[model samples]
Target: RIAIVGAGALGLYYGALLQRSGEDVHFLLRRDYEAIAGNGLKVFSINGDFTLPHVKGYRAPEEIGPMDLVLVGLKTFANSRYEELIRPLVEEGTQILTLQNGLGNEEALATLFGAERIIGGVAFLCSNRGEPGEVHHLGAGRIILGEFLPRDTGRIEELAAMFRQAGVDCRTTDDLKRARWEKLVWNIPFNGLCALLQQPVNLILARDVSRKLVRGIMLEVIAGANAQGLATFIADGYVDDMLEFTDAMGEYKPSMEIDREEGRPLEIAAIFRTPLAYGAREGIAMPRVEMLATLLEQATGE
Candidate 1:
């Protein structure tokens, strides 16, 4: 059994698709919970022909039962308040996967639930909420999961097979932390920079000044992760890889961009700001990250 702890855009996209693929996936939703009780979870994807109706969705954790897997797609800001939400859905031997962006979340969960039960994973899907009960899928969608454990337990392979059957590209690894840091090597730069410049990724890259800023941000993130002892080798031509990925896509805005524009809670402080803070604690210098956080703080009036 799979229970998604969030029913937001990301949750809806994954739940609908996974359930459509014949997995017993349940969405733990809140907003419009009453409205969707019987109407079922609905999704509208722009990437390809897709839709799911009469899907199982829950608003509260207590209303759910034991589950084999739990995928958390909630915002970083809401991570701390999830103790009560998580308590009811977890049982002994249940594996909970944190598929959120940014760092610090796995530690937070490990503190709350202990480390053994937590499965750390990172998502690389381009998605957004279109409207109430609607999700628009865009760009490449894939996921990677694993741990630094000594061996490849079949559980990881089983989950990958499940996701693959659901039409999602999945990969497993022995060093998941390194995989996560590698993704951050890309995110902190692009996500933080876009929010600061308030422009599309390519638009920021087009400006030579912004190009330097972007690279500086990436270097800061890489330095912080490396200082923390995570081996994240940037495969050759990573800069061109990132540039090509964003350049060919439509002029799309990031999740942080959407959050700031809507006056919603921000994930930058936790994702970019806090990592830079850690770098400082570790005696590592990340002036560029500091400046980015300062600018973001000013923008958000923090």
Candidate 2:
């Protein structure tokens, strides 16, 4: 059995996909519990559309007890209460996979569930939780799963197979730390600029000046990654590749932009502050990234 620890956009997207694939998946919902249980979980996706008329929704982890795997999709702001929320569903042989944005999520979970049981996952999905029990899937749904360090590729493979069977694109990586930095390459610039300019991604890239700033930010992130001894993991020409990918993605609002518009706190610590601090420690100057982080923190009062 599998338990989805959060019922946010990513959580509901994955949970619904897995449930449709015949996986015995339970969604642990805090909000919209009654609405989802009564109205069912509905997803209108670019990939496809589906609904679970009778999804088992649990308000508390204790209601679900232990499970084989727990997919955590909670926002970083709510991570302080993660231990309280997940401990009840943990037991011997239980594995915890955090499908969250930014950094330090795997570290946080590892502290609670032991290093051996923690898996770090990066979700590359363009989606939003618009209403109670409703998710708008814009495009893209590929996930990269990995371990904190090189320990067991077996579990990674197992989870990859499960997601593939569920019609979701999934891949495994041996170097999760490197993968996190690679993700930051796209996230740092686009997410930051989107929030700062209060514009959609396409609008941000439409201007030559903003596009140049985006490239500069991506290069700074790559440099930060290299300073952390991930030189080989972050290959050459990655910045260009990422730029092309983002351009192809068209108009969209990233996670941070959405959070800012909704009047919620930005994920400054994990996504921005953490990497900037690490870069500073390594004697690398990420001035642009640092300025963006600081501006966002002051802007959001986070």
Candidate 3:
């Protein structure tokens, strides 16, 4: 059995896909508990629309009991609740996989849970929650899975195989650090601008000068990314791919944007500050990212 903690768009979309493949999944719920329990979960994906008529939804970790895998999707600001949520879900053979954004998530889990049992994933998906029982998948769904501590490549491959078996575009990575940095190139710009302006991704890409500005920010992040002595140095063309990838997707909202709009605590520390610190340690400068982070903090008082 698998337990989906913090069942937002990221959690619901993936859990629905696995359950559609006949895997047993339980969703530990909060706001969507009653709606999902009453109406079941619906997924409106660009690929196809499917509904799970009976969702295994629960209100407490104790109610869900132990599970084979615990997928943690809680926003970084709410990570303080990790123990209360996942402690009861951990059994002898249980594993914790965090698909949350930005950095230091694996470290936090490794400090609490066993380092050998934590797997970090960088999810490159465009999705948002709709009505309480529904989630919208706009485009782009590829997951790169990696382990915090290298134990056995074969075991991680088995996990990747399981996701692939469920029709997920999944792959394993030998360098989670590099993978996270690569993901950050997109996260830093889009997430910050979208939330700050209270607009969607198009606002950043709609104008010519803005696109140039976005590319400049991406380059600065790449500079810092390359300075960190990662196993692989990201090339500049990667920025081009991100811009194109974002442009191709539908009008979508970043997770931070939604969090701000909902009056919840923003993930400024995790997604922005943490990465900036990582870059700073390497003597790398990211003026634009720093500016964006400051403005975001000022605007939200987060």
For candidate 2, report its TM-score: 0.96
Candidate rank order under lDDT: 3, 2, 1
Candidate 3 local lDDT, 74-100, one digit each (tens)? 889888888888999998889999999
Q: Estimate each model's TM-score.
A: 0.92, 0.96, 0.93
**Poorly placed runs, candidate 2 (over 4 Å):** none
Best candidate (score: TM-score): 2
What overall lDDT goes with each candidate model?
0.75, 0.87, 0.89
Give the per-residue Cα lDDT of candidate 1 at 209. Answer: 81
Number of colliding residue pairs in each model: 0, 0, 0
Off by over 4 Å in 3: none
Candidate 1 residue pairs in clash (backbone atoms < 3 Å) = none
Of models 2 and 3, which has the larger lDDT? Answer: 3
Q: For residues 1-302, what per-residue lDDT tens digits would candidate 1 score against the true structure?
A: 99988776677787788888788988777776665665655565555656565767777788888888888888888987879888888888787788888777777887887677777777887777745667777766788887433345687888888888888888888778777777876777677777777887778878888776676777666677677765555443565566666677668788888777778877875677667777788888888877777788788876
